[PDB]
Design a protein around this nucleic acid. Structure first.
Ligand SMILES: [Mg+2]
Ligand SMILES: [Mg+2]
Ligand SMILES: [Mg+2]
Ligand SMILES: [Mg+2]
Ligand SMILES: [Mg+2]
Ligand SMILES: [Mg+2]
Ligand SMILES: [Mg+2]
Ligand SMILES: [Mg+2]
Ligand SMILES: [Mg+2]
Ligand SMILES: [Mg+2]
Ligand SMILES: [Mg+2]
Ligand SMILES: [Mg+2]
Lengths: 117, 110, 56, 46
RNA sequence: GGUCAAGAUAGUAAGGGUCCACGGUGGAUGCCCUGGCGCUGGAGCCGAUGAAGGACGCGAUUACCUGCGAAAAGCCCCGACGAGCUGGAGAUACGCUUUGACUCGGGGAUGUCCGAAUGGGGAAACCCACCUCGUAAGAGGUAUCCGCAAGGAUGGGAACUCAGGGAACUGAAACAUCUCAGUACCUGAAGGAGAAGAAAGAGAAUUCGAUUCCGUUAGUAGCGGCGAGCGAACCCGGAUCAGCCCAAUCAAGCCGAAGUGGCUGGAAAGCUACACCUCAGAAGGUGAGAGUCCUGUAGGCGAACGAGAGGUCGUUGUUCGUGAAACGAUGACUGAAUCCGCGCGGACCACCGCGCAAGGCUAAAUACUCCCAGUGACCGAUAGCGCAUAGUACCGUGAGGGAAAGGUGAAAAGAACCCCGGGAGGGGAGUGAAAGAGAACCUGAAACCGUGGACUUACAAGCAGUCAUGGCACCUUAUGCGUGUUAUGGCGUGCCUAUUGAAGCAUGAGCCGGCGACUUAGACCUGACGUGCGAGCUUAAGUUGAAAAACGGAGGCGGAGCGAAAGCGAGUCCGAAUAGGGCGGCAUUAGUACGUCGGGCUAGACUCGAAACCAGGUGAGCUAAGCAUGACCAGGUUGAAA
RNA sequence: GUAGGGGAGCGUUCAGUCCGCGGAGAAGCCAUACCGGAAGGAGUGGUGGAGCCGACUGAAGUGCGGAUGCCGGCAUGAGUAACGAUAAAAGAAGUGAGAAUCUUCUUCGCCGUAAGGACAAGGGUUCCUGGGGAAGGGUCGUCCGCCCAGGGAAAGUCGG
RNA sequence: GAAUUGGCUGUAAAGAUGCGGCCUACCCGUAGCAGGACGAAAAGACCCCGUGGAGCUUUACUAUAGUCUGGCAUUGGGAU
């Protein structure tokens, strides 16, 4: 008995192909090139996934120190005084608190000032 | 390429017999046998029809036209079936002809 | 001997062919036989170009 | 220039000929072998 | 709200991108069979009454095949079938046939020319003769080779068999003996089979009894640069079994049991409600899926005619390579007995034991598959033979090589008629279930070419992505957990191999499809797991059944080790007894058969790739020369001997 | 985590058994936002016109991106290079669906020890006549050495 | 291989359009040029490697056609 490769390779390749959308030119059209693109695509996917958390870390900091500097502190000073109060484990996403809510971050700045001198 | 030569290509019916139609269309409808073609298993019966045109680019009053023609058929039909419907006859014998067989199911006359 | 290095792309070739658009004849109605013919030429239809010239 | 092939009726025949191919038995070998090999026809008809 | 100023900001797409929609190109995939493949079985030679294979002919119309053969797609006799027939052929015309055509069997009858070719010649199918018979037309004879004569042979055959002749690559990781292997190749002879055969034997029992074949002995006994490697035979189990002469039933075929109504449908053999046969439910066909619709099947019958010696020298064979080399076999030279005789038993002698050479024949068990049949955890259109027929097209002076190849529809109903056009091609009409089947006619993938739409793009440095947010658009796993597109930000050195190290300016590759590489075999070896019996465990060939498996103890493995062996034995070895090697006891360690898998060995051994080596043939129509025989060199200048 | 060892599995063909599905439509093919730890597998939709899932076991010609791998088809270069001798053409006329290319006329240029003529060898109806316009013709084509049909070849003395 | 294919300087398997930093640069063509794409072409013919090959050579090894030579055979007689 003999089992040809019939109807197998094709389904496989279409599965590969289908991931490809805004993929430019032969990347979205020819198989081998597509699949191959999806190797490096693997790399960037996973690695930059672990990375995105570094990225948002960066963003929020970049905001918080901004509000801080606006009110007379800075990130070093503000977070120092915050931690210096066992009070605020506030920490995470405090950025938006500084962005949307002016008087709140004014109270946090004043408070963190108390916890310094 | 095969083709109707399946059977031993003998014929259960004859050129002169009256026959009705098993299955098909014109089921139950009947007619005299006109052409019996054994090899290609093709039976012409007077009852079953096709209305069909011939091509004359210029031929025989070129003036194209359409005919009333006969619908040629397969083994679907029954030989001379006496009690007023189709029935499948086998047995043979001889009566007034010692040189020949005959046919029936329940009856004896075809 | 100076061969091309890569197949040029669908996009690059279709880009080069960008300029090949045919420039459709600007036609004009013949004043005499009133059918459309061309400037500074004889109207093929009537044969009339300022009075009448070709045997039509 | 002048090619390899200079067609000759009394040559193509005097060698390769069924007669010629029958003159020797390595020839007649070629014959019957050619026969069984399907119908591969011998030069008098070729 | 009008003009100055300073700002910011949209849109346009020449062309591009992504997605979507719709075509085109192509022919993958699914379906199918009109074709293959090998298993088992059957059958097995044809030709001087002319083979095999062809040439040219034959047809109302004939180019290809088929079939024949100047009596030509046929002719006559017998048998069967009993309405059709007039070959593939689609096609008009002419007809033939119950005074039995056609078709199927069975004998004869004609059979052009070539070819063993055979009157003579010849570049096969052609050119020339002679002797008879005589009325021309036309028939008959005229090769050599055996023989009184009758008669026999020359040729052909896929594989198989015997024989004359006889390779190398390769292996020994180099290479001479060795291995490849008496393999391949050539040649001779012949049949359906051949070969072989009726003991001057095998052999160690005062056993056996022709040959061949299978299992087995047995990877044993042996041969070997004792290297690589090579490798019996007797016994025993089976298949089948004979020894005789001589020299003083199966083919044509015929017969065959049993269903109707309603329903979906284009169409039913399907569903359904009731019913029937079955020494017949194996199978194919019939508009779809079939016992009871056709052919069939089980069963039954069935014909005129037809089949069923010794030595020496050079050497060689078998396990036998010169080895202690016996024996058979011969090329040369030699060339004994014959019945108180003669050859053998592995140098040789005696004894002892088997055996009668120098003459022939001789079914069966065996091998093979051109052909036919039946089957298949065999292929199904890049598969399967190369061919769904082709050794054709096509390549070559030739020997030789060598293709792709399939699908309307259930039925031609194969599309009158109308419209654009010379046409091609399309659009209507009509048929049809379907023309979403229309003859570039099953599905119709991907590359690749277009048309339309959506969001987008004309200060931007780019492995084409990935992440994150915004804009626009869409809502059939689908109002979000979204899908499509996009603007900006962040990040970001193709894949593969080969490598110390690859984005590499190192390999490979245009793109998509399909083809495409770690197998198979043996009663081999060794392990893991699993089963069955278990101090025991199994069979091999074969025999008999064969919708099935049983029988078969010849043999193999355990069961005792030690040694160079004789031998001895829970002991055995070396040696004059004590030291040790091996080992049994163990404190206790069970096997064998089968299966799957992990390896090993022998074969191509994962697939692809050499330069080369050897055998048999084809080539001097190109070119290198010879031979025989022909042809050719305008015109002018120079001015030798005599 | 590379060679390498070990374990679980996914898919394809055939096979036996079981459950079954199909003209109110099978396989295949096409789209898809769902499921699954992955190989993968479902759901609905669109094509299609006969067949086919699933479970359990068994057997493999059983899984491709590469091998300058094989067959086929289709791209790139790109409407690029070329159209095969630098012996030139020109006008009228005709035909035709359509003519720079066919026909005729009138000129022009080219060979003229040839680029004329007659045979051999070889080719095999290419000749003539009448039609044709798919392909062949390097453009065109009404034309041809192309396609169709019918005709044509005559020897006592020439060559055998 | 696919490309959406600039410049300098540096780094990288040591000669970067594709890495870094800095400069430059609107979109698409046509005629041209040959510096780069270690541009194409041919599994480098040089060199080395292979217990690869083949032609040739000779006082390398080994065999052998051929040839010389003793005996035996055809192959006999007589004198000495
Ligand atoms: Mg535009
Ligand atoms: Mg050698
Ligand atoms: Mg070797
Ligand atoms: Mg189609
Ligand atoms: Mg790979
Ligand atoms: Mg160019
Ligand atoms: Mg140019
Ligand atoms: Mg043309
Ligand atoms: Mg140039
Ligand atoms: Mg180069
Ligand atoms: Mg090299
Ligand atoms: Mg050289």
């Amino acid at each position: 008995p003999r089992a040809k490769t019939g109807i197998v390779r094709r389904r496989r390749h279409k599965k590969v192909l289908k991931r490809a959308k805004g993929f430019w030119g032969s990347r979205s059209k020819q198989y081998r090139n597509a699949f191959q693109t999806l190797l490096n695509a693997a790399t960037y996917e996973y690695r930059d996934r672990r990375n995105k958390k570094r990225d948002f870390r960066r963003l929020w900091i970049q905001r918080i120190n901004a509000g801080a500097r606006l009110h007379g502190m800075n990130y070093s000073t503000f977070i120092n005084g915050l931690k210096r109060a066992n009070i605020d484990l506030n920490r995470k996403v405090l950025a938006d608190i500084a962005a949307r809510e002016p008087e709140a971050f004014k109270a946090l700045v004043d408070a963190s000032r108390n916890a310094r001198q | 390429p095969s083709a109707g030569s399946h059977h031993n290509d003998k014929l259960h019916f004859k050129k002169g017999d009256t026959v009705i139609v098993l299955s098909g269309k014109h089921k139950g409808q009947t007619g005299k046998v006109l052409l019996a073609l054994p090899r290609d298993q093709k039976v012409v019966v007077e009852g079953v029809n096709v209305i069909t045109k011939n091509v004359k680019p210029s031929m025989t009053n070129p003036q194209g036209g359409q005919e009333q023609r006969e619908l040629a058929l397969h083994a679907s039909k029954v030989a001379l079936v006496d009690p007023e419907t189709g029935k499948a006859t086998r047995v043979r014998k001889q009566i007034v002809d010692g040189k020949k067989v005959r046919v029936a199911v329940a009856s004896g006359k075809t | 001997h100076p061969v091309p290095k890569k197949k040029t792309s669908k996009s690059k070739r279709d880009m080069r062919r960008s300029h090949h658009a045919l420039t459709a004849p600007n036609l004009t109605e013949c004043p005499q036989c009133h059918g459309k013919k061309l400037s500074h030429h004889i109207c093929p239809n009537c044969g009339y170009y300022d009075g009448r010239q070709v045997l039509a | 220039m002048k090619r390899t092939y200079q067609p000759n009726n009394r040559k193509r025949a005097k060698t390769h000929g069924f007669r010629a191919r029958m003159k020797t038995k390595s020839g007649r070998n070629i014959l019957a072998r050619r026969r069984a090999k399907g119908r591969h026809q011998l030069t008098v008809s070729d």
